[PDB]
Amino acid sequence: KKTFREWQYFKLSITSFDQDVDDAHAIDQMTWRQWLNNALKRSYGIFGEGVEYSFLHVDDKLAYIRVNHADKDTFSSSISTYISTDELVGSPLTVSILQESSSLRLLEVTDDDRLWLKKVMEEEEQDCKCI
Amino acid sequence: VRLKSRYILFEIIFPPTDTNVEESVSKADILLSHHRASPADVSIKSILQEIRRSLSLNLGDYGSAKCNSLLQLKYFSNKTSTGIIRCHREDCDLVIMALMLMSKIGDVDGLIVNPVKVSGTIKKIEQFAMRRNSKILNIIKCSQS
Amino acid sequence: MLVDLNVPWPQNSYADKVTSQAVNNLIKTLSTLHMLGYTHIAINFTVNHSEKFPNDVKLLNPIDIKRRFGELMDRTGLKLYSRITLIIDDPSKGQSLSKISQAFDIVAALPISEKGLTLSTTNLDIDLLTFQYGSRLPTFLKHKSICSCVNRGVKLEIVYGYALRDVQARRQFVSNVRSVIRSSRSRGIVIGSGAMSPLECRNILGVTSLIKNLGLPSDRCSKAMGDLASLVLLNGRLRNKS
Amino acid sequence: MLVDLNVPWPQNSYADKVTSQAVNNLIKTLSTLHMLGYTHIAINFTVNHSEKFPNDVKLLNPIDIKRRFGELMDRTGLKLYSRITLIIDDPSKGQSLSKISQAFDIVAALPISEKGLTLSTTNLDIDLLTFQYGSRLPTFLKHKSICSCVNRGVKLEIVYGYALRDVQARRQFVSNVRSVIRSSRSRGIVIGSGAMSPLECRNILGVTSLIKNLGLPSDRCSKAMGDLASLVLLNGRLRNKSHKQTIVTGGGSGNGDDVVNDVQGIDDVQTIKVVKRSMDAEQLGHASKRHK
Amino acid sequence: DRTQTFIKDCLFTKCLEDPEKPFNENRFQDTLLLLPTDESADKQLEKRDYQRINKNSKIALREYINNCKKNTKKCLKLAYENKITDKEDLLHYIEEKHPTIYESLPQYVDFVPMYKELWINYIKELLNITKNLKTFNGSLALLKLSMADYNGALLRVTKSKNKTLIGLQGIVIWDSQKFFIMIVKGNIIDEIKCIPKKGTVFQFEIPISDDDDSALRYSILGDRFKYRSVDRAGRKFKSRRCDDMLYYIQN
RNA sequence: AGUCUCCCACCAAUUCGUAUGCGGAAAACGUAAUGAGAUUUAAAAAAAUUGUUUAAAUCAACUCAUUAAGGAGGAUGCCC
RNA sequence: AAACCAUAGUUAUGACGAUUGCUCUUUCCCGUGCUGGAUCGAGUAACCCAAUGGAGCUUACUAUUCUUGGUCCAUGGAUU
RNA sequence: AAACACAAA
Numbered sequence A: 001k002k003t004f005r006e007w008q009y010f011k012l013s014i015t016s017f018d019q020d021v022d023d024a025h026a027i028d029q030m031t032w033r034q035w036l037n038n039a040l041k042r043s044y045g046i047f048g049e050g051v052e053y054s055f056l057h058v059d060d061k062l063a064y065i066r067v068n069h070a071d072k073d074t075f076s077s078s079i080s081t082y083i084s085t086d087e088l089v090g091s092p093l094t095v096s097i098l099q100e101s102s103s104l105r106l107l108e109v110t111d112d113d114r115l116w117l118k119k120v121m122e123e124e125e126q127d128c129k130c131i
Numbered sequence B: 001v002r003l004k005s006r007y008i009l010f011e012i013i014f015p016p017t018d019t020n021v022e023e024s025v026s027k028a029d030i031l032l033s034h035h036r037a038s039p040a041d042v043s044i045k046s047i048l049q050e051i052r053r054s055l056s057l058n059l060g061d062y063g064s065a066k067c068n069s070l071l072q073l074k075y076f077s078n079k080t081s082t083g084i085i086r087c088h089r090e091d092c093d094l095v096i097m098a099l100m101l102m103s104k105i106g107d108v109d110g111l112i113v114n115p116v117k118v119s120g121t122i123k124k125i126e127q128f129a130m131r132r133n134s135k136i137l138n139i140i141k142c143s144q145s
Numbered sequence C: 001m002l003v004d005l006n007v008p009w010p011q012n013s014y015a016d017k018v019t020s021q022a023v024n025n026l027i028k029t030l031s032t033l034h035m036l037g038y039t040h041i042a043i044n045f046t047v048n049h050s051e052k053f054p055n056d057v058k059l060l061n062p063i064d065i066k067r068r069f070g071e072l073m074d075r076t077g078l079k080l081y082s083r084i085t086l087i088i089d090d091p092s093k094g095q096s097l098s099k100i101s102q103a104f105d106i107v108a109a110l111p112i113s114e115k116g117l118t119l120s121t122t123n124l125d126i127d128l129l130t131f132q133y134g135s136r137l138p139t140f141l142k143h144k145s146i147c148s149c150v151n152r153g154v155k156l157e158i159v160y161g162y163a164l165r166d167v168q169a170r171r172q173f174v175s176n177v178r179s180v181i182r183s184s185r186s187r188g189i190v191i192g193s194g195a196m197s198p199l200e201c202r203n204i205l206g207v208t209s210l211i212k213n214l215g216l217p218s219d220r221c222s223k224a225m226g227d228l229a230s231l232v233l234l235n236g237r238l239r240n241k242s
Numbered sequence D: 001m002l003v004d005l006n007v008p009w010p011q012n013s014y015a016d017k018v019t020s021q022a023v024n025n026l027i028k029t030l031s032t033l034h035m036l037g038y039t040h041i042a043i044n045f046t047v048n049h050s051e052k053f054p055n056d057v058k059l060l061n062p063i064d065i066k067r068r069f070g071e072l073m074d075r076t077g078l079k080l081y082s083r084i085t086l087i088i089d090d091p092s093k094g095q096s097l098s099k100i101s102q103a104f105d106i107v108a109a110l111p112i113s114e115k116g117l118t119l120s121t122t123n124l125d126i127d128l129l130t131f132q133y134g135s136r137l138p139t140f141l142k143h144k145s146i147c148s149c150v151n152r153g154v155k156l157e158i159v160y161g162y163a164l165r166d167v168q169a170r171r172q173f174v175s176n177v178r179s180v181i182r183s184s185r186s187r188g189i190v191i192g193s194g195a196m197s198p199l200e201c202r203n204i205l206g207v208t209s210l211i212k213n214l215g216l217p218s219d220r221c222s223k224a225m226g227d228l229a230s231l232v233l234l235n236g237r238l239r240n241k242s243h244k245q246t247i248v249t250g251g252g253s254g255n256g257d258d259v260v261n262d263v264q265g266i267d268d269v270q271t272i273k274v275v276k277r278s279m280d281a282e283q284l285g286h287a288s289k290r291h292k
Numbered sequence E: 001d002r003t004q005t006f007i008k009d010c011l012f013t014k015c016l017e018d019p020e021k022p023f024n025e026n027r028f029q030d031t032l033l034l035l036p037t038d039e040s041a042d043k044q045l046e047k048r049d050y051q052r053i054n055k056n057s058k059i060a061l062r063e064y065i066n067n068c069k070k071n072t073k074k075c076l077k078l079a080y081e082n083k084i085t086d087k088e089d090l091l092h093y094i095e096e097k098h099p100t101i102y103e104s105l106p107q108y109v110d111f112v113p114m115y116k117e118l119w120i121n122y123i124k125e126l127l128n129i130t131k132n133l134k135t136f137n138g139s140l141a142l143l144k145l146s147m148a149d150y151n152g153a154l155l156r157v158t159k160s161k162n163k164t165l166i167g168l169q170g171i172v173i174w175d176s177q178k179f180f181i182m183i184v185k186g187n188i189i190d191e192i193k194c195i196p197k198k199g200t201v202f203q204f205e206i207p208i209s210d211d212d213d214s215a216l217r218y219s220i221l222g223d224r225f226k227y228r229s230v231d232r233a234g235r236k237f238k239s240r241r242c243d244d245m246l247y248y249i250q251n
Numbered sequence F: 001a002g003u004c005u006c007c008c009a010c011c012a013a014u015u016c017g018u019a020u021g022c023g024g025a026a027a028a029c030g031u032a033a034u035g036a037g038a039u040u041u042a043a044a045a046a047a048a049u050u051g052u053u054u055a056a057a058u059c060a061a062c063u064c065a066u067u068a069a070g071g072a073g074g075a076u077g078c079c080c
Numbered sequence G: 001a002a003a004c005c006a007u008a009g010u011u012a013u014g015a016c017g018a019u020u021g022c023u024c025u026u027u028c029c030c031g032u033g034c035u036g037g038a039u040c041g042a043g044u045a046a047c048c049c050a051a052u053g054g055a056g057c058u059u060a061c062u063a064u065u066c067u068u069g070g071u072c073c074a075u076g077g078a079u080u
Numbered sequence H: 001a002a003a004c005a006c007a008a009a
């Protein structure tokens, strides 16, 4: 009756106050990954650490995270809980989930990286339809 | 209203880890070599603290917080190594996985934990324990021949 | 009834001869397995794809269940089966299965490269496919090859024993088991116990709860663990005899 | 619409004097809650029971919404309400609610004992029931008492903002929230964030995810934050502004002049509403026909 | 009693399984009660004539409402037949061509002038509306308004569950228990308006034009207007739910 | 669910020998026709149950007061 | 010293998977229509839970937190 | 917990 969802996207964005410390430091992709690995291990044990997640279109205080449909609850309970402390910033970090989607239909800017990811995702879509 | 309880019966089994000695292959021989005895340094607060540490170490913070609401050891005696752990019907899987992931006691090593019976009342647990104890005596009487 | 088909044999190559202590430890492990409650036991033997296979028929299996475990089979009341896994890396020094499939019962494979997954999904008459749960999985498990290998009959084997060894590889084991559960879509998932010591043996309830918390539904666990394992054993027996 | 009713004020006793840093931090957190998005914010003030209430009326409210929040709202665009939580444990003779209830808008309670809980559930005229999620629960909460209370009025409040304080408090917070939700039958639940700084604030999605991980469905969370929050604001507002639900001092013409919405127009030093003459006897009764 | 209690316990341990159950839960009563289970003439005249006057006035009001209901319909039908729009022509045409149906029709120009003034003066004296407005008290004013009489009051329906009842102004002719009775005027509309109170909001404005042009903005709630006191005080009130006021915030 | 009622031995009768609007073993039990009533009332306001807890323009709802079963004759109204 | 007896029976009444049907919304066709048919989607409610059995009464439920039938000297719009 | 009472509240 229902189609099996592969995973689910999550719109992540950093919220760091203290404009001076904010413009002083500059986060990157590895920073994001380390923050996630620290949050999962702080809020959960190996259960949270074994959560599958990849990085797509990382920007300045913006990133998109795809999480399995079975672990959306574990991800959304851990993201809104943890607050970074002495990782790379003098001012602790707090993240707020802007929006969520389960159909890939979201467009912020007219860039083409979403188009390329969409192209590879439908070339996998027809491939899982046939296979 | 009713508080939905679910008791858990577990057994402490000691595998005869000794490769230098030859062993007898039978039913009652291995039943006796696995049910030998529990060490003296065994109590209720020493097993509860160990399982509480393992729960936080495997699940995490929220996994221990949701599970430690009604986590108590109701009946346990070190002579037969049989214990009854009370928990919710929601967190039964968590307690079972923690009892499976039990590594060792802080001072006693080389032991495994086997969950046998899970039920929502103590009377059926006692009946099943009596049935298991009666079954144990049969192979013993048969092998004593 | 339960089926355990991932008991490792303390021998990697053909050159190294087994010792009495290893056989004693294996006997301890099998007795602990029967104590916790099991019906079918299928010990596994690991070998490399580059190692030279001997040109024999009566020497392919350095197990000899009849003279070693045949007495335990009569006394304690269980059965043993032969299983061999193929640690494949590169399509070279191979192209031989009609002689290794008749001696042993179950034939498995262990791909560690992206070409190994293709060679396993395309041109291997295997029944189960296992990964290195301890270390990192080779590149990425996708639905493309997994669906095509499960639709024909090949299942994916999960080693719940590898987690009980150390503390650090637990993270990698969990990250691999959740990945393979997400990719396999929870149909062809068989479970095995890869423990060589009796101190890493568990029961059905604990393993079921672990696999359920890892991402597998409750019906899938029991249905697979019982029926798929029994069917794999039957298919292996049919491949050996007729 | 989103309502947060437990914004704490940096003062517990009347002997304390609030410095400018705390007011600046409160202004910053109000701006933070407004920028991302919010509709109603009611700041909280906490005092104990055995203390000596000052025999004043014009000094009971150290909030002065017209003084500094009057500086902030014209640029912010939202409204603020003053509320008080009563820390009542032992039924002492100190009881002067007839002044603080009429001076403030919302009156809540913080019971620690069983007798205090019983008297606050039966006789004490309050609006919300808040428990000490930091400490241990007083007793095993009953079902019939909470159901009769939420049918009679007062509902329970859950504050997810306290779980962000330390690590050892999270287990007790979850254990108390589970018991409250199990005993309250998920009817009278109002959610709030007790954050003292803008850095411990979250979005509505984080809130609904946390509560759905706690055990309450997300649709019920949305309904309790949309309708139940508005209703618990309305009750505590018109129980003090108007009489006992018989005569209202505010007349809603359109869709913005509401007793809880219109806050700068309605006078507070008195209860009158001086408006120009807009209702005559010669105008046509039918609004579809009435034209000016 | 101690040795007696020991005897009772050694006796209960034979019948019951937990001997210290009743003594703990207090089921062993120490006492057994043994008892079988156990100038009026003119006053009556005035009461009867008051009963009769009430019973007659009820039917009179009902039939008056029905007569107005039928007369409005018939006169509007005849007006649409004759194609006459404004009221100043229609009422004169009816008077010059239909004498009977004209003594049954009401007159808004007859109903507004004294009623409005006699209610405005009464409310001004009740709420103590003075040239200066620094001698007010909101609590006592609201209490008086809850105790005040609204017989012949101007109220406007500003909010209601039905999107069509809003905006109707009228002066009271009688205060019922479920419906509210007013009279409205339009192009040809002279309808007696009955409005439900369960879920509607009313309001009344009191004009004050001594020096400046200002008015008080008061309002009532029909839903909770049914359980109030009448002309007296001291009626124990009950918290209902304060829950079905969602329409007030919604729109 | 509820601090409501009743059956769960009998009695050609100090044992509700109660042919009493109908049904029913009983029931603080269901329903039908008419008249009246509102702290000025037979009784609701200044045993149980229920957040609001019958009505008080008309309708609707509650309470109380009368109408014993079957057969035969006459009168009236309807198809005829 | 037992009388131990329930087409749930004494703190139990589990765990997920699959199918039809029900309510609205964005679509195409024959005949207007038809508990006419098929895709894109959302939801399956609440009161609440037995402890010996049956009947009567009262009291809690169904607002994007499933539904159904009728009535209204209730109002809103249109024709005669 | 349920279920019971000319209790108790």
Ligand SMILES: [Mg+2]
Pocket: H002
């Ligand atoms: Mg019951």
Ligand SMILES: [Mg+2]
Pocket: none
């Ligand atoms: Mg009861």
Ligand SMILES: [Mg+2]
Pocket: none
């Ligand atoms: Mg009962």
